[PDB]
């Protein structure tokens, strides 16, 4: 009777059986469509491709992400993503297993209700739940008191949790993500005279961003240093063989999480929004949030982000109230792992929204029973 957990990213789908160590299916949340006429009659054409199927063919295709900033869009493609996830990649019918889904803290209220409507009506899922990602990051970390910086594609948010209470008024949502870091890396790479126009090379730029980018422990000296000496320049081989070379740029791109102004963003950066989120808590707990401070999600994976975070938030902390930054190396998966363990808890078995209850209450049931 093992449940399913699929963490619906904006960049990846992560899914597996509840209680596994780590997920079986990880594939990009892209739908691909052909943009050319096929010449060879009897090619065996088919209209649309999902994930690794699309990405393997992307030069022939155009690729839409159906999720922007955690907001599901173009939902027929989302329904295709889920259908592929259960039927092809898991190979297991959804009507046999309850299912758990993950969402960014603050997003348009109808979206949960429509997602639920799909899950019951299309798939006849026995029972369903939705959980706030930055809760699950603490289940994953083995912590009951926490502040969580969680960022992937689509969204960033802070949530403070003290001893299993969330503190809703303190929740800061910030809309920087690996998507905007990618679009910036494209525009700035044009400064060195390389051009990337379409979705099919967007994923090349993303692969560059994954391998080469890193965060400067101090930016402003190293910006001048790399312009002064080339030892920080490094080079990478595109598909179709031509090599490109990237220097100061590779740190300059992820620095924009700390300097959102470069993208033209008004807000504070992740460090200052973390500080403001702690400041909204009552002073009884601020020391305990300062210490037990946890990174979550793939955007955090840039080397040196943890030491940069510790250095920069030290400058806002009153020096007595010491701090620590818990970055486990799994953390790209932590939001999934916390849902895997959560769905296995006996106490949780009460919490499932059953089909019988949805029949009573309609799509509005989600906010009434759930968080």
């Amino acid at each position: 009777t093992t449940a399913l957990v699929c963490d619906n990213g904006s960049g990846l789908v992560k899914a597996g059986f509840a209680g596994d160590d780590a997920p079986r299916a990880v594939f990009p949340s892209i739908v691909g469509r052909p943009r050319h006429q096929g010449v060879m009659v009897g090619m065996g054409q088919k209209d649309s491709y999902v994930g690794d199927e699309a990405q393997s063919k992307r030069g022939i295709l155009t690729l839409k992400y159906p999720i922007e900033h955690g907001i599901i869009t173009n939902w027929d493609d989302m329904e295709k993503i889920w259908h592929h996830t259960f039927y092809n990649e898991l190979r297991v019918a959804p009507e046999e297993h309850p299912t758990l889904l993950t969402e960014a803290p603050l997003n348009p209220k109808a979206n949960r209700e429509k997602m639920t409507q799909i899950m019951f009506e299309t798939f006849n899922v026995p029972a369903m739940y939705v959980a706030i990602q930055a809760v699950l990051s603490l289940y994953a970390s083995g912590r009951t008191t926490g502040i969580v910086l969680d960022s992937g594609d689509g969204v960033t948010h802070n949530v403070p949790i003290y001893e299993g209470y969330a503190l809703p008024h303190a929740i800061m949502r910030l809309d920087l993500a690996g998507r905007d870091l990618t679009d910036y890396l494209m525009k700035i790479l044009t400064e060195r005279g390389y051009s990337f126009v379409t979705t099919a090379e967007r994923e090349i730029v993303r692969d560059i961003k994954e391998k080469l980018c890193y965060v400067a422990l101090d930016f402003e000296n190293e910006m001048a240093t790399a312009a002064s000496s080339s030892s920080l320049e490094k080079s990478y081989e595109l598909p179709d063989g031509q090599v490109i070379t990237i220097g100061n740029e590779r740190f300059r791109c992820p620095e924009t999480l700390f300097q959102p102004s470069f993208i033209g963003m008004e807000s504070a950066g992740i460090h200052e929004t973390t500080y403001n989120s702690i400041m909204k808590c009552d002073i009884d707990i601020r020391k305990d949030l300062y210490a037990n401070n946890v990174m979550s999600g793939g955007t955090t994976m840039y080397p040196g982000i943890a030491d940069r975070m510790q250095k920069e938030i030290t400058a806002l902390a009153p020096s007595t109230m010491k701090i620590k930054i818990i970055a486990p190396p799994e953390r790209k998966y932590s939001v999934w792992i916390g849902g895997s363990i959560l769905a296995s808890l006996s106490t949780f078995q009460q919490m499932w929204i059953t089909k019988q209850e949805y029949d009573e209450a309609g799509p509005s049931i989600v906010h009434r029973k759930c968080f």
Binding site: E68, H69, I71, T73, P108, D175
Partner: peptide, 7 residues
């Protein structure tokens, strides 16, 4: 989204 931003 529906207003202030493209989603």
């Amino acid at each position: 989204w529906x207003a202030x931003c493209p989603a």
